[PDB]
Enzyme design. Structure first.
Site, mmCIF file in Angstrom:
data_model
loop_
_atom_site.group_PDB
_atom_site.id
_atom_site.type_symbol
_atom_site.label_atom_id
_atom_site.label_comp_id
_atom_site.label_asym_id
_atom_site.label_seq_id
_atom_site.Cartn_x
_atom_site.Cartn_y
_atom_site.Cartn_z
ATOM 1 N N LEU A 7 0.810 -1.208 0.000
ATOM 2 C CA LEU A 7 0.000 0.000 0.000
ATOM 3 C C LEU A 7 0.848 1.264 0.000
ATOM 4 O O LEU A 7 0.339 2.336 -0.285
ATOM 5 C CB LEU A 7 -0.888 0.017 1.242
ATOM 6 C CG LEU A 7 -1.669 -1.269 1.494
ATOM 7 C CD1 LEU A 7 -2.457 -1.128 2.785
ATOM 8 C CD2 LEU A 7 -2.587 -1.541 0.320
ATOM 9 N N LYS A 8 2.128 1.133 0.339
ATOM 10 C CA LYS A 8 3.031 2.285 0.396
ATOM 11 C C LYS A 8 2.365 3.385 1.215
ATOM 12 O O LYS A 8 2.349 4.550 0.796
ATOM 13 C CB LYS A 8 3.317 2.814 -1.014
ATOM 14 C CG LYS A 8 4.066 1.845 -1.917
ATOM 15 C CD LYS A 8 5.560 2.014 -1.800
ATOM 16 C CE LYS A 8 6.281 0.987 -2.633
ATOM 17 N NZ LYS A 8 5.689 0.955 -3.995
ATOM 18 N N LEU A 9 1.834 3.022 2.383
ATOM 19 C CA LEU A 9 1.143 3.997 3.226
ATOM 20 C C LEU A 9 2.032 5.195 3.488
ATOM 21 O O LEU A 9 3.200 5.061 3.850
ATOM 22 C CB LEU A 9 0.678 3.360 4.538
ATOM 23 C CG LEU A 9 -0.431 2.318 4.339
ATOM 24 C CD1 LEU A 9 -0.984 1.854 5.703
ATOM 25 C CD2 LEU A 9 -1.555 2.933 3.485
ATOM 26 N N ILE A 14 -0.939 10.668 7.434
ATOM 27 C CA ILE A 14 -0.751 11.005 8.841
ATOM 28 C C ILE A 14 -1.080 9.771 9.672
ATOM 29 O O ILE A 14 -1.751 8.850 9.199
ATOM 30 C CB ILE A 14 -1.660 12.170 9.283
ATOM 31 C CG1 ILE A 14 -3.130 11.735 9.242
ATOM 32 C CG2 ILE A 14 -1.445 13.384 8.354
ATOM 33 C CD1 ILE A 14 -4.067 12.806 9.763
ATOM 34 N N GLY A 50 11.756 -4.764 -8.863
ATOM 35 C CA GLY A 50 12.578 -4.201 -9.923
ATOM 36 C C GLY A 50 13.291 -5.283 -10.714
ATOM 37 O O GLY A 50 14.244 -5.017 -11.461
ATOM 38 N N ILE A 51 12.812 -6.513 -10.543
ATOM 39 C CA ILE A 51 13.371 -7.674 -11.217
ATOM 40 C C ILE A 51 12.561 -7.986 -12.470
ATOM 41 O O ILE A 51 11.340 -8.135 -12.406
ATOM 42 C CB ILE A 51 13.357 -8.887 -10.265
ATOM 43 C CG1 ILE A 51 14.123 -8.532 -8.986
ATOM 44 C CG2 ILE A 51 13.924 -10.115 -10.952
ATOM 45 C CD1 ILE A 51 15.589 -8.124 -9.224
ATOM 46 N N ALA A 55 10.937 -6.739 -15.624
ATOM 47 C CA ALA A 55 10.462 -5.584 -16.386
ATOM 48 C C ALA A 55 11.331 -4.339 -16.215
ATOM 49 O O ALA A 55 11.657 -3.669 -17.195
ATOM 50 C CB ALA A 55 8.999 -5.266 -16.007
ATOM 51 N N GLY A 102 14.415 -4.257 -15.377
ATOM 52 C CA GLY A 102 15.807 -4.493 -15.732
ATOM 53 C C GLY A 102 16.706 -5.191 -14.719
ATOM 54 O O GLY A 102 17.824 -5.620 -15.054
ATOM 55 N N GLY A 103 16.245 -5.307 -13.480
ATOM 56 C CA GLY A 103 17.060 -5.970 -12.474
ATOM 57 C C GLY A 103 17.185 -7.467 -12.718
ATOM 58 O O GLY A 103 16.255 -8.102 -13.213
HETATM 59 O O1 U5P Z 1 10.656 0.408 -5.072
HETATM 60 C C1 U5P Z 1 9.670 -0.230 -5.433
HETATM 61 C C2 U5P Z 1 8.611 -0.439 -4.555
HETATM 62 C C3 U5P Z 1 7.504 -1.168 -4.974
HETATM 63 N N1 U5P Z 1 7.443 -1.697 -6.272
HETATM 64 C C4 U5P Z 1 6.318 -2.577 -6.660
HETATM 65 O O2 U5P Z 1 6.837 -3.885 -6.965
HETATM 66 C C5 U5P Z 1 6.131 -4.403 -8.107
HETATM 67 C C6 U5P Z 1 7.100 -4.481 -9.291
HETATM 68 O O3 U5P Z 1 6.454 -5.090 -10.412
HETATM 69 P P1 U5P Z 1 7.228 -5.326 -11.806
HETATM 70 O O4 U5P Z 1 8.154 -4.220 -12.141
HETATM 71 O O5 U5P Z 1 7.966 -6.748 -11.669
HETATM 72 O O6 U5P Z 1 6.044 -5.530 -12.875
HETATM 73 C C7 U5P Z 1 4.978 -3.430 -8.375
HETATM 74 O O7 U5P Z 1 3.851 -3.756 -7.556
HETATM 75 C C8 U5P Z 1 5.596 -2.107 -7.923
HETATM 76 O O8 U5P Z 1 4.548 -1.205 -7.550
HETATM 77 C C9 U5P Z 1 8.506 -1.481 -7.160
HETATM 78 O O9 U5P Z 1 8.478 -1.957 -8.295
HETATM 79 N N2 U5P Z 1 9.618 -0.746 -6.735
HETATM 80 O O1 U5P Z 2 -0.502 16.522 5.300
HETATM 81 C C1 U5P Z 2 -1.601 15.972 5.269
HETATM 82 C C2 U5P Z 2 -2.038 15.344 4.106
HETATM 83 C C3 U5P Z 2 -3.296 14.752 4.081
HETATM 84 N N1 U5P Z 2 -4.129 14.779 5.210
HETATM 85 C C4 U5P Z 2 -5.499 14.221 5.114
HETATM 86 O O2 U5P Z 2 -6.451 15.289 5.260
HETATM 87 C C5 U5P Z 2 -7.553 14.817 6.058
HETATM 88 C C6 U5P Z 2 -7.515 15.522 7.417
HETATM 89 O O3 U5P Z 2 -8.643 15.090 8.179
HETATM 90 P P1 U5P Z 2 -8.944 15.610 9.673
HETATM 91 O O4 U5P Z 2 -7.533 15.734 10.434
HETATM 92 O O5 U5P Z 2 -9.533 17.100 9.526
HETATM 93 O O6 U5P Z 2 -9.874 14.679 10.349
HETATM 94 C C7 U5P Z 2 -7.348 13.311 6.240
HETATM 95 O O7 U5P Z 2 -7.927 12.589 5.149
HETATM 96 C C8 U5P Z 2 -5.822 13.213 6.220
HETATM 97 O O8 U5P Z 2 -5.446 11.908 5.775
HETATM 98 C C9 U5P Z 2 -3.685 15.403 6.384
HETATM 99 O O9 U5P Z 2 -4.382 15.427 7.400
HETATM 100 N N2 U5P Z 2 -2.419 15.999 6.407
#
Ligand code: U5P
Ligand code: U5P
Lengths: 208, 208
Positions: free
Chosen positions: B58-60, B63, B163-164, B166, B168-169
């Site tokens: 998800l690459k969260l 905040i 990065g393996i 597609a 190039g890795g």
């Molecule tokens: O630094 C990163 C971090 C995450 N991904 C994820 O790893 C997978 C790479 O897929 P592919 O290049 O083998 O098709 C994808 O889900 C891509 O979003 C990367 O490729 N590089």
């Molecule tokens: O720097 C940032 C970037 C995005 N949000 C987003 O803005 C909204 C803020 O909501 P609230 O703190 O007013 O409840 C949320 O969706 C939060 O994820 C932040 O709060 N700060």
């Protein structure tokens, strides 16, 4: 100027809240919580039920190919704007901009933002100025930084400021500092009376 | 150990691919494209159909409060691990770790990663060492960087390298450099014969 951040999981609950405060807002911002809980189609339904533009706050931060796959699906679902991080680099940002209007993160509102993001603010503004996105994210929790950014950001680029209400930021201070949009989530959707909460912020910004 | 990056929108199609290459993979990585296309429940479905662990890439990067709301739904859907960015700060990382096992991004594989992320690698390794996630993301496109990270990364923390193929890795070089897992997406799911493609990479990494 108010942008409602609908961070609830339930789609019908989100629609109910949005309809009740529609009169006081400019746009609706959806994030992963609502998309996960209701499906991406919730974007189209919110637009049809409210008539306002929708910002998909995805904080995209993947490689170009994946950002493309994600953005095409979300813009395809009706999003008017997609928020993307700047720290992952120019190529990932462009992969999204090629599909629709974007908002670039410049400085975030939470404490952790001071660890790595804030120290690079100047660099991020430089990138935003060259790319020219619809707008950028600035910290509603730090109005002085909103001014800092505004002073260095190309005039045509808008500033949206989250961190108003729950996180402690004041709407009036953010507008005064240069925010074009005031993002508000919990202070409205968690309020006993969301409409009354939105009206209070609307009044504050009008200076009444 | 191969981690399948199942970045297709269609759920039935994803399950078919997963089942066909199960013999040659150790885990399955789901990202936003599949979640958007088939719903978060696709995670439970894949685990029921394959019996392999699932990584939610998800690459969260939000905040703390929002990161918690997202991780709650994703771990709740059956994810065994969640990938989170380190750039956004320690508080945002811990909000996710408090709910389940995480993998922290240290250095990405695309060209854009060289702009802001790569220059801070040393600092990110330090944060990962303090938090002790299950593993970290290192660049399969830059083998020399994998070894650099491995030498400075706490012994118990695993390294997963995308990065393996597609991008190039080379799989052998990444493993030789110290990757415990190599993530492969397109090289497998874009292949006329996914199973044959997976087996070829599997044999490539045998005997590091
Ligand atoms: O630094 C990163 C971090 C995450 N991904 C994820 O790893 C997978 C790479 O897929 P592919 O290049 O083998 O098709 C994808 O889900 C891509 O979003 C990367 O490729 N590089
Ligand atoms: O720097 C940032 C970037 C995005 N949000 C987003 O803005 C909204 C803020 O909501 P609230 O703190 O007013 O409840 C949320 O969706 C939060 O994820 C932040 O709060 N700060």
């Amino acid at each position: 100027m108010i942008v409602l951040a609908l961070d609830v999981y339930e789609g019908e609950r989100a629609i109910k809240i949005a309809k009740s405060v529609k009169d006081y807002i400019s746009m609706i911002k959806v994030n992963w919580p609502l998309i996960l809980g209701s499906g991406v189609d919730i974007i189209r339904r919110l637009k049809e039920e409210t008539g306002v533009e929708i910002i998909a706050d995805l904080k995209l931060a993947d490689i170009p190919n994946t950002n493309r796959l994600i953005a095409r699906k979300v813009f395809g679902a009706g999003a008017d704007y997609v928020i993307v991080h700047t720290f992952v680099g120019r190529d990932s940002v462009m992969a999204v901009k090629e599909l629709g209007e974007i908002i670039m993160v410049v400085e975030m509102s939470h404490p952790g933002a001071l660890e790595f993001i804030n120290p690079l603010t100047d660099r991020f503004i430089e990138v935003a100025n060259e790319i020219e996105p619809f707008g950028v994210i600035a910290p509603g929790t730090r109005p002085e930084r909103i001014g800092y950014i505004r002073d260095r950001l190309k005039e045509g680029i808008k500033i949206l400021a989250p961190g108003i209400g729950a996180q402690g930021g004041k709407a009036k201070d953010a507008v005064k500092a240069g925010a074009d949009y005031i993002i508000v989530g919990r202070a409205i959707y968690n309020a006993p009376n969301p409409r009354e909460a939105a009206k209070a912020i609307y009044d504050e910004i009008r200076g009444v």
